[PDB]
Amino acid sequence: GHMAEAWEELGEAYEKQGDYDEAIEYYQKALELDPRSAEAWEELGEAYEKQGDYDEAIEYYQKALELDPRSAEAWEELGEAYEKQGDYDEAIEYYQKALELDPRSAEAWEELGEAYEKQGDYDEAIEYYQKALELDPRSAEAKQNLGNAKQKQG
Amino acid sequence: GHMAEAWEELGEAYEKQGDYDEAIEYYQKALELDPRSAEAWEELGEAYEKQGDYDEAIEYYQKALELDPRSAEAWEELGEAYEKQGDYDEAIEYYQKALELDPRSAEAWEELGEAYEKQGDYDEAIEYYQKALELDPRSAEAKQNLGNAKQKQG
């Protein structure tokens, strides 16, 4: 409830200032009060991810997902963490689920593209960056990747 | 004040569901009420950056810095937006500004290491990653990148 969400918001304010020790303390208080808050687990996970600790991040992202598995964002956040560890096949699995739940997520399409590009699958990567650009034609990321993919193939 | 901050938190709430359009609407509302909040311009910039819209991100981060030129985090975010566009020299200038403002930020060192690595300065990259790891020894990211730099060095 409200007290928990307020501790969470304090965590978010400290996290966003590089005060990770503090942020985590306040996320932990939020979760003591409401251990069922998927968003508070996610943000705790993000605090670790921002510091490059993917293993801790992943533990908390798993908890967030298990509490709200209908959230495309919860699947995406895990995919992103796997992609950063070089676990591309698992990244792909998570992103595929995210795209089943929220198929208009330009960011999830682009992320899927990057996973395939990292495996040397330029044909697929091109499809996904094209899809991301159709959903958000302003992504410079998707446009650059599309170009790099195209050179790396054609 | 609090009214602006509440719009900013509404922005954040929507952004966590991937709802970037509504998030931008509410961050802009916050700015209409308090256009002198550096943090609110940064939040807007971060929303664009998250979507791969680096041009727009930069415009908003520059505004943030005009209001708070001592914000290390804002310099870091500006650097990231240039880096992701492949403008490494500008990225490095901004990352160095961030580091000089807050040398205890592991992320500032790590991002400079990444930029040097991408330019082929592996010995310097290594030194930067080591500094990051001295501040944040649980960064798998820094360790992975350090390993790669070592691998590319010889």
Beta-carbon separation of A51 and B106 below 8 A: yes
Task: Return d(Cα B93, Cα A13) in angstroms, integer.
Answer: 27
Neighbours of A28 (CB within 10 A): 14
Closest CA to B29 of B53, B57, B6, B59: B6
CA atoms within 13 A on the CB side of A112: 27
Which residues of chain B from 111 to 130 reach within 8 Å of chain A, CB to CB?
Answer: none
Question: To which residue do tokens 């719009």 refer?
Answer: B7
Question: To which residue do tokens 């699947």 refer?
Answer: A75
Closest CA to A135 of A104, A103, A101, A95: A104
Phi, psi of B34 (to 5 degrees): -135, 85
Beta-carbon separation of B18 and A85 below 8 A: no
Please list every residue in chain B whose beta carbon sits closer than 8 Å to the beta carbon of residue A51.
106-107, 136, 138-139
Q: How many residues in chain B?
A: 154
Which structural technique was applied?
X-ray
Three-state helix/strand/coil letters over chain B: CHHHHHHHHHHHHHHCCCCHHHHHHHHHHHHHHCCCCHHHHHHHHHHHHHCCCHHHHHHHHHHHHHHCCCCHHHHHHHHHHHHHCCCHHHHHHHHHHHHHHCCCCHHHHHHHHHHHHHHCCHHHHHHHHHHHHHHCCCCHHHHHHHHHHHHHHC
Torsion of CA A24, A30, A31, A34, to 10 degrees: -170
A142 with A129: CB under 8 angstroms? yes
Tokens (6 digits) for B53 = 């819209």
Neighbours of B33 (CB within 10 A): 16
B80 with B48: CB under 8 angstroms? no
Beta-carbon separation of B52 and A105 below 8 A: no
Domains (ranges, CATH) in chain B?
1-93 (1.25.40.10), 103-154 (1.25.40.10)
> What Cα–Cα distance (Å) separates residue A62 from each residue in A15, A75, A148?
20, 9, 33
Q: Is A69 helix (H, G, I), strand (E, B) or coil?
A: coil
Q: Quote the radius of gyration of chain A (alpha carbons, Å).
A: 17
Question: To which residue do tokens 């040097």 refer?
Answer: B116
Resolution, given in Å to one decimal, reads 1.5
Give A139's DSSP letter: -
Tokens (6 digits) for B76 = 């870091």
Query: By the CB < 8 Å criterion, does B105 face chain A?
Result: yes
The minimal CB distance from A106 to the residues B51, B102, B140 is found for B51
* Amino acid at residue number A28: Q
Expressed in angstroms, the distance from the first to the final Cα of chain B is: 55
Tokens (6 digits) for A3 = 């007290």
Non-local (6+) Cβ contacts of B135 within 8 A are: B104, B105, B106, B109
Q: Is A16 helix (H, G, I), strand (E, B) or coil?
A: coil
Neighbours of A26 (CB within 10 A): 24
Tokens (6 digits) for B49 = 């950056």
CA-angle at B127, arms to A20 and A57, nearest 5°:
30
